[PDB]
Amino acid sequence: MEFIQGIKLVKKNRCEVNANEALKDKDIIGFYFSAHWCPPCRGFTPILADMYSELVDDSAPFEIIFVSSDRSEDDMFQYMMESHGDWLAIPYRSGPASNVTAKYGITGIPALVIVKKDGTLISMNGRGEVQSLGPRAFQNWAR
Numbered sequence: 001m002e003f004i005q006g007i008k009l010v011k012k013n014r015c016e017v018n019a020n021e022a023l024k025d026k027d028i029i030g031f032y033f034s035a036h037w038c039p040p041c042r043g044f045t046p047i048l049a050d051m052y053s054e055l056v057d058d059s060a061p062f063e064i065i066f067v068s069s070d071r072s073e074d075d076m077f078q079y080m081m082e083s084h085g086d087w088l089a090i091p092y093r094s095g096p097a098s099n100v101t102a103k104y105g106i107t108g109i110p111a112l113v114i115v116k117k118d119g120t121l122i123s124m125n126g127r128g129e130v131q132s133l134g135p136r137a138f139q140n141w142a143r
Contacts, residue, residue, distance in 0.1 A: 003119070004019055004023075004094070004096040004097070005019065005020050006019075006020065006096075007019050007090070007094050008091075008094075009091065009094070010073075010076075010077075010089055010090075010091050011088060011089075012077040012080040012081045012089070013077070014073070014077060019088060019090065022087070022088045023065075023088060025062055025087075025117040026117055027061040027062055027116075027117050027142075028061055028062030028063075028114070028117055028122075028141065028142050029062055029063050029064075029065060029114075029116070030062055030065065030112060030113065030141065031064075031100070031104070031112070031113040031114075031115070032048070032065060032066065032067060032068070032084075032085065032112050033067045033106055033109040033110065033111050033112070033113070034068050034109055034111070035069030035070050035109075036110065037070060037072055037075035037076070037078075038069070038072065038075065041110070044110070044131070045079070045083075046083070047134075048084060048130070049082070049083035049084050050134070050135070051130060051131075051134055051135045051137070052085060052086055053086070054135040055135055055138060060086060061138070061142065062138075062141070062142070063085075063086075063087040063088070064085030064086065065087075065088075065089075065090060065097075065100075066088065066090060067097055067100070068109060069092070070092055071092045076089055077089075108125065110127070111125050111127055112126060112127040112130065113125070113126075114141045116142075122140075122143055123140055123141055126141055129141075
């Protein structure tokens with residue numbers, strides 16, 4: 001009985017909500033790790049933004065979790081509003097976000113983890129997988 005549910009997330013609009021309902025998803029969820037906001041690493045973002053953008057247009061049957069040294073409230077909301085992930089971002093001060101990364105055994109950043117809303121595993125480092133299959137990856141990410 002240990003999960004993020006129960007905490008409050010921050011909306012790119014500098015707002016706050018209960019990740020419980022804010023995380024919507026109710027279908028699939030994808031955790032993204034790469035605070036590439038402070039350091040360089042452009043080129044990959046516009047890829048996921050085009051993927052979540054398409055899926056989003058289709059009501060993207062999944063939500064993107066905002067993780068990674070995003071301690072930047074400006075670079076956090078900016079990147080989120082820049083076209084990256086169309087949902088919420090766990091306030092770096094949301095322990096559950098750390099234990100989450102450390103719980104999933106990530107730390108392989110940059111990397112993208114995909115899990116089912118119910119908490120089912122599908123594809124972890126499916127990064128290149130999604131970027132490879134693009135918006136059509138929804139099958140592998142939702143296989």
